[PDB]
C-alpha cells in the first residue's frame, strides 16, 4: 500500500525533542541576526509551529538572500533545482 508524502510523515524521531529540552528554547535564537550571503543550517525546533519548512530539508545548508517580515529568505540546492523558503530564525543556525 503506497502513501503520499505529507508534512508529519516519518517524523517520530526527526521532530521529537530530547526529554530535557521540553519547553521554550533560550531567547538567543528568536532574535538571531543574519546578513546576505551568510550560510545557515536548517534545524527545526518542534515546539514552534510558525515558519517551519518541510522537514524533508532538515539538516541542509543554504544561503540568505533577503528578508520578508520577520522571516528570512533561504535558497537551497535540490539536485540541480533551486528552492526558496521563508523561515523564522529560531529554525536556523549560523555556520561556525
Amino acid at each position: 500500500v503506497k502513501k503520499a508524502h505529507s508534512f508529519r510523515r516519518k517524523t517520530r524521531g526527526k521532530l521529537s525533542k530530547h526529554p530535557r529540552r521540553r519547553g521554550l528554547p533560550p531567547l538567543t535564537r528568536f532574535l538571531q541576526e543574519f546578513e546576505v550571503g551568510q550560510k545557515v543550517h536548517i534545524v527545526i525546533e518542534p515546539s514552534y509551529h510558525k515558519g517551519m519548512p518541510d522537514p524533508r530539508f532538515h539538516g541542509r545548508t543554504g544561503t540568505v538572500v533577503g528578508k520578508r517580515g520577520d522571516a528570512y529568505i533561504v535558497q537551497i540546492t535540490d539536485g540541480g533545482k533551486v528552492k526558496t523558503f521563508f523561515i523564522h530564525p529560531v529554525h536556523l543556525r549560523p555556520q561556525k
Partner: protein
C-alpha cells in the same frame, strides 16, 4: 532531581523572578525598556536594552538618592528617571513591570505618570493612572483623622528646577 527525563527549569524561573514568555513578547519590540519594580518600602526604576551576553542598564534611580514606598514617591521617581533619560538621549521606551499584576491604582503606573510628565514618550492609557487625590497624598492626609502636600509640592519644584 529524580533521574533523567527530569527537566530542571531555568534559574531565574526556579527562583521566581522572571517570566520568559512575557520577556519574549517585550524583546520582540526593539525599543528600550523601562523596568519598574516595587517592594514593601522602596521603588526602583531602570532603563534597559538587550545584549546577547546580558541586558545592559543605561540609567537607573532609587528612592534613597531621591531622599538625599507609596504613590507620591513613585511619581517623584518617575519624574527623576524621565529627566535623566531624556538627557541621556533616548526619547522612546516601553514599560516592563515583571511579575506584579496590573491594577489601576498602583504606584507602578504612578511611576509611568511621572516618567511621562517628565516628558518621555511612552504609550499608555489615561485610565489606569491613579487619581491625583492619591497622587498628592490626600489619601494619607485623610487617614490622618482616624508627609504633607506642602513637602510634596516643594519637592516637585526642587526636582524640576534642578533638571530644567
Amino acid at each position: 532531581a529524580h533521574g533523567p527525563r527530569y527537566r530542571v527549569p531555568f534559574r531565574r524561573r526556579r527562583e521566581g523572578k522572571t517570566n520568559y514568555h512575557k520577556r519574549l513578547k517585550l524583546l520582540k519590540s526593539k525599543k528600550p525598556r523601562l523596568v519598574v519594580r516595587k517592594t514593601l518600602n522602596h521603588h526602583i526604576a531602570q532603563i534597559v536594552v538587550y545584549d546577547p551576553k546580558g541586558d545592559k542598564t543605561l540609567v537607573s534611580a532609587h528612592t534613597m538618592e531621591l531622599m538625599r514606598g507609596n504613590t507620591p514617591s513613585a511619581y517623584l521617581l518617575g519624574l527623576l528617571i524621565g529627566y535623566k533619560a531624556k538627557q541621556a538621549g533616548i526619547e522612546e521606551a516601553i514599560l516592563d513591570i515583571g511579575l506584579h499584576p496590573p491594577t489601576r491604582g498602583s504606584s507602578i503606573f504612578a511611576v509611568l505618570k511621572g516618567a511621562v510628565d517628565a516628558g518621555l514618550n511612552v504609550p499608555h492609557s489615561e485610565e489606569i493612572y491613579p487619581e491625583d487625590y492619591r497622587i498628592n497624598g490626600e489619601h494619607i492626609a485623610n487617614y490622618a483623622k482616624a508627609k504633607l502636600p506642602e513637602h510634596f509640592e516643594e519637592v516637585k519644584a526642587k526636582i524640576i528646577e534642578k533638571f530644567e
